[PDB]
């Protein structure tokens, strides 16, 4: 969370196993695996997603929902943003070299 230092609020970050529909409401996205991220006490929350595969679909989903809006005191910006980072762990394995499909001669 990259907003002000005076902002507070919560978010519910849900996770759906591969081969399962993404939740359609906040209510049923809380019956899966989830983390209540509080931006008043934390500034970063980390997930570690298992079962990532080439799949050559069925894939997991990560969704995020409003839980108790965002609350700010007087004289504070009315908008904030969230950035996202991603990387492999260390369990990755790669096999069979081939040309990238992002280059055209």
């Amino acid at each position: 969370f990259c907003g002000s230092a005076m902002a507070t609020g919560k978010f519910l970050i849900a996770y759906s196993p591969p081969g399962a529909n993404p939740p359609k409401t906040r209510k049923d996205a809380m019956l899966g695996t989830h983390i209540i991220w509080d931006i008043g006490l934390q500034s970063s929350c980390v997930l570690c997603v298992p079962w990532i595969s080439q799949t050559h679909t069925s894939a997991g989903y990560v969704t995020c929902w409003y839980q108790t809006g965002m609350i700010v005191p007087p004289g504070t910006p009315n908008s904030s943003s969230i950035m996202c980072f991603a990387s492999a762990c260390n369990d990755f394995s790669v096999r069979m070299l081939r040309d990238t499909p992002f280059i055209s001669q």
């Binding site: 507070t8 809380m30 609350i71």
Partner: protein, 239 residues
């Protein structure tokens, strides 16, 4: 700090825990087999409630507020006798430019007299889903309603003397969180889950919310409940 509790649902929080009557939830220690379900223990987060300048109170009946929740609410459909304690975390998010006081309180076996004396009311006049009911400042005067005057608590008692039950005060200029661990209190060991409401939870704001100009017009209140040590009657033949 942050304790970062987990059970399959992670809640980061933190005042200190107020244990009911000094008794923690506990398993009941034949011709009655019994058996616990330990997969029901996990947080269930009810929808946020807007605390505004208008609002004068709220209430929820348990365990009829967790009836639609997955697994815990499905054991009520099968097993016909049950018991369980609870761990309730009520927490607000507010600035330092807001002010208010709340009283989180758990009242066991709170009967509520109807509005209009000598008149029966439905069971949807105080419990339905996980929806939060609301007290009214002025006296109720409707045929199919509970008496919701805030200064009598809907029971004809002083509202100031509800500090005789497990409680904690969320004063916004000090703390912002409260935790109550309620044990199972009843006159029998197990009872049907739909015919009885073990207790009610109430949030009552003494000192109205105020917040000056160009600041958020509400403070959200978020209730989170995880059942502890639930146990039900067995469904298999004896030897």
């Amino acid at each position: 700090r942050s304790i970062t509790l987990g059970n399959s649902t992670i809640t980061t929080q933190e005042a200190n825990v107020v244990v009911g009557y000094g008794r923690w939830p506990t398993y009941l220690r034949e011709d009655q087999p019994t058996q616990p379900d330990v997969a029901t223990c996990r947080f269930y987060t009810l929808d946020s409630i807007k605390w505004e300048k208008g609002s004068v109170g709220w209430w929820w009946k348990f365990p009829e507020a967790l009836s639609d929740m997955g697994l815990f609410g499905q054991n009520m459909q099968y097993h016909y006798l049950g018991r369980a304690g609870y761990t309730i975390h009520v927490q607000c998010n507010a600035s330092k430019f807001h002010q208010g006081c709340l009283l989180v309180v758990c009242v066991p076996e709170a009967e509520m007299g109807g509005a209009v004396v000598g008149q029966a009311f439905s069971a949807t006049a105080m419990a339905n889903g996980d929806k939060a009911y609301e007290f009214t400042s002025a006296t109720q005067s409707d045929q199919t309603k509970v008496q919701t005057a805030i200064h009598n608590a809907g029971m004809g008692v002083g509202v100031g003397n509800l500090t005789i039950y497990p409680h904690q005060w969320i004063n916004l200029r000090t703390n912002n969180s409260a935790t109550i661990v309620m044990p199972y209190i009843n006159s029998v060991p197990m009872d049907n889950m739909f015919r009885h409401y073990n207790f009610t939870l109430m949030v009552i704001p003494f000192v109205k919310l105020d917040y000056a100009d160009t600041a958020s017009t509400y403070v959200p209140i978020t209730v989170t409940v995880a059942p502890m040590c639930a146990e039900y009657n067995g469904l298999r033949l004896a030897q």
